[PDB]
């Protein structure tokens, strides 16, 4: 992984040593080159994972998450450089540095062989994320959002640290390959119940699990646009990636310990989907949409079937591109009208025709139109959950109806009807904005041609 | 607030329109339109305004009982089949300010004319604001009526968005 | 009821401005001023060819347009599709599966030359 870690680190001197007026050009160009080389991680084998060294490895689960991560950095630089245009040079460079450091921690997080190396980098991502939210967020609420983000994550992750060290003392190793062969079944005792919760709650909070999600509508809404993109696209998926890994050592206890969290997710997805119908803040609506989608990933991971694991991997990738696109679309309106209220600016299809096409495509992927990879992931999860219990099709079916309703409600409210008379500063869409949207949707639809590369290790 | 006379005349127009929806055929409608007018003429002269109010309330109850459940609506009236059909084509004039110079060069005459209108609006604005300040009581305006221009070379205050509004068939 | 003198005067002032505005929406004869226009030599033939009129040379042009369509949108696509099916799809097993042909009594099998026997004698119903 050093062929990706070292180039990522070099983005920092590149940013600091660049000419003042070339910081965005230079960092964007070279971050795209790194993203291009990440395609070499697609050398996956049917039986064995691609094991680089004692520290790092990549299998079909981490590889797509790595490619998404490295793809997101140039998109975030494009999304940020407009609203940071009046920031002074040194603070711009520090903003880019936080983004680079977050990428460094993420790519090492997804390839860490040892769960305690995974833990340190998994917590490490908090620091740059907190700084981005609180320093460069726009509203007073960013300070409160940072505290909710920080202490929800740590309340869960500190018990995880105790559990992981306990496992290493008992097994002798936290190396993930070793745990595949030395894993022992978990006896059903009270002490193992709390080991199970310690190993899972930190990941549940990051998903987020319904009930433990209050940090997300604060953090995702108060962050700057780059903060929201990475928060929704990648950082929510650390929880899914962590759960997909750690459930290996929790069988068979997951059979019954899953029930309370499956109920929270199956009912929670309907609750959060309903909330979207009455949200007044466009960014807040998009944030609650993420909670509903990640409820499917939680359920898929907990029922532990080959189909649910393929579906979960696809959804995580599909949601990452879609939710990031929606935040970027919402941000482009915000940079014009300087409000997040959804009813403020209406009929934007009349004033911004091409941008209204991006809204439509973003909405259709969000409601999982076939054959998008959003639908492929959702379908595979619904199939596996039907086998877990036929009755689940009712909750899955209702959620798909509600999801269509709020996805198109967002489209209709903002893009259709009559334009707001007094809003007269809706200038034409910039080339930058149009390129930013198409760099989300084009890869998303291309993956429909070759879905296997985002179906994970069970494929 | 609607006066009593306004309430009666609104009822008469509503009653006739629903009557027409029932009758359909023109000769049949002419017949019953004249019977309905005769009913209104029967109490045209009713000086007692307490009794004229009672007649009005009963007529409205009779109307609600007799209204057509699916009355005729002019196509472009609210609730009609073409209501708001062309709003998607109505673009505000301020959008022309954002046209690229190569797009403006295709209509040099239109945009030269447009600059004269914008100059006219700029030069009138201070006088329009002043006229409203001086003609408005201290508490503030008590109705939504706007005044005309009192002088020569003055424009009626707050004219721009009325005069320059999109055409009903903009495209 | 009826407009007050103030209301009438304002409506008249607005009516004059509105009609001046609407009159100013008319395009002048030269508008739109289009930029340098490129033409094709293939159009050169047809512009002169059809200004004559007639209904015998308004048919050659129609035949020409339909033939260019048939070639680009039928013949070339079927060539590509036929090449795709003959040399890529049908070279793999069970990609194209035909329902086997119906065989009737008295038929002859082309592959084998076998002759299928006729059905037995019908107990001729009245009709």
């Amino acid at each position: 992984m050093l062929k990706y870690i070292i180039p990522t680190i070099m983005l920092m001197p590149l940013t600091w040593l660049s000419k003042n007026n070339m910081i965005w050009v230079n960092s964007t160009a070279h971050s795209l080159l790194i993203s291009f080389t990440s395609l070499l991680l697609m050398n996956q084998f049917g039986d064995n994972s691609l094991n680089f060294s004692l520290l790092f490895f990549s299998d079909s689960l981490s590889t797509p998450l790595l490619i998404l991560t490295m793809w997101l950095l140039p998109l975030m630089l494009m999304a940020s450089q407009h609203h940071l245009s009046k920031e002074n040079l040194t603070r711009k460079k520090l903003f880019i540095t936080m983004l680079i450091s977050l990428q460094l921690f993420l790519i090492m997080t997804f390839t860490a062989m040892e769960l305690i190396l995974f833990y340190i980098l998994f917590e490490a991502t908090l620091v740059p994320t907190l700084i981005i939210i609180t320093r460069w967020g726009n509203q007073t609420e960013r300070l409160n959002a940072g505290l909710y983000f920080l202490f929800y994550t740590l309340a869960g992750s500190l018990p995880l640290l105790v559990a992981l060290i306990y496992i290493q003392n008992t097994v002798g190793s936290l190396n993930f390959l070793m745990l595949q062969y030395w894993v022992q079944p978990v006896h059903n005792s009270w002490s193992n119940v709390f080991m199970w919760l310690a190993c899972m709650m930190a990941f549940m909070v990051k998903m987020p699990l319904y009930g433990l999600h209050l940090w997300l509508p604060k953090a995702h809404v108060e962050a700057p646009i780059a903060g929201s993109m990475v928060l929704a696209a990648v950082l929510l998926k650390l929880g899914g990636y962590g759960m997909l890994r750690i459930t290996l050592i929790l069988n068979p206890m997951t059979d019954f310990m899953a029930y309370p969290f499956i109920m929270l997710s199956l009912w929670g997805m309907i609750m959060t989907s309903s909330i979207c119908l009455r949200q007044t803040d466009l960014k807040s609506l998009i944030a609650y949409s993420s909670v509903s989608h990640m409820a499917l990933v939680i359920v898929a991971i907990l029922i532990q079937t080959p189909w649910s694991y393929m579906g979960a991997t696809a959804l995580m990738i599909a949601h990452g591109l879609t939710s990031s696109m929606l935040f970027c679309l919402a941000n482009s309106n915000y940079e014009r009208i300087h409000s997040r209220t959804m009813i403020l600016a209406r009929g934007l299809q009349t004033l911004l025709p091409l941008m209204a096409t991006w809204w439509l495509l973003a909405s259709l992927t969000n409601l999982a139109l076939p054959p998008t990879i959003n639908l492929i992931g959702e379908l595979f999860v619904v199939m596996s959950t039907f086998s877990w219990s036929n009755i689940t099709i009712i909750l899955m079916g209702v959620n798909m109806v509600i999801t269509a309703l709020y996805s198109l409600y967002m489209l209709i409210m903002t893009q259709r009807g009559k334009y707001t008379y007094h809003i007269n500063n809706i200038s034409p869409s910039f080339t930058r904005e149009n390129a930013l949207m198409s760099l989300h949707i084009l890869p998303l639809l291309l993956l429909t041609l070759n879905p296997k590369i985002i179906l994970g290790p069970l494929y | 607030y609607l006066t009593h006379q306004q309430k009666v005349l609104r009822l008469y127009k509503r009653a006739l329109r629903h009557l027409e929806s029932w009758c359909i055929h023109r000769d049949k409608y002419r017949y019953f339109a004249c019977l309905l007018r005769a009913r209104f003429d029967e109490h045209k002269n009713e000086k007692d305004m307490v009794k004229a109010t009672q007649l009005l309330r009963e007529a409205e109850e009779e109307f609600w009982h007799g209204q057509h459940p699916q009355p005729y609506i002019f196509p472009e009236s609210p609730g009609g089949t073409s209501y708001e059909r062309y709003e998607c084509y109505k673009v505000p004039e301020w959008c022309l300010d954002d046209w690229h110079p190569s797009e403006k060069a295709m209509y040099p005459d239109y945009f030269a004319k447009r600059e004269q209108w914008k100059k006219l609006r700029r030069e009138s604005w201070e006088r329009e604001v002043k006229q409203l300040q001086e003609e408005t009581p201290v508490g503030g305006p008590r109705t939504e009526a706007l005044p005309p221009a009192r002088k020569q070379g003055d424009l009626p205050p707050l004219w721009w968005h009325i005069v320059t509004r999109p055409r009903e068939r903009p495209m | 009821s009826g407009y007050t003198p103030e209301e009438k005067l304002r409506l008249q002032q607005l009516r004059e401005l509105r009609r001046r505005w609407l009159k100013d929406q008319e395009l002048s004869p030269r508008e739109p001023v289009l930029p340098p226009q490129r033409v094709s030599p293939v159009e050169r033939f047809w512009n002169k060819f059809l200004q004559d009129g007639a209904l015998w040379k308004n048919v050659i042009y129609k035949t020409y347009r339909h033939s260019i369509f048939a070639f680009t949108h039928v013949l070339i696509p079927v060539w590509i599709i036929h090449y795709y099916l003959k040399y890529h799809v049908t070279t793999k097993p069970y990609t194209i599966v035909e329902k086997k042909p119906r065989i009737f009594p008295g038929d002859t099998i082309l592959e084998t030359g076998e002759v299928i026997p006729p059905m037995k004698e019908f107990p001729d119903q009245h009709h």
Binding site: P353, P428 | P92, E93, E103, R167, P170 | E26
Partner: peptide, 12 residues
């Protein structure tokens, strides 16, 4: 009589 059609900028 040809009239001017007010549209948003299509250039960009």
């Amino acid at each position: 009589k040809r009239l001017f059609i007010i549209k948003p900028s299509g250039f960009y």
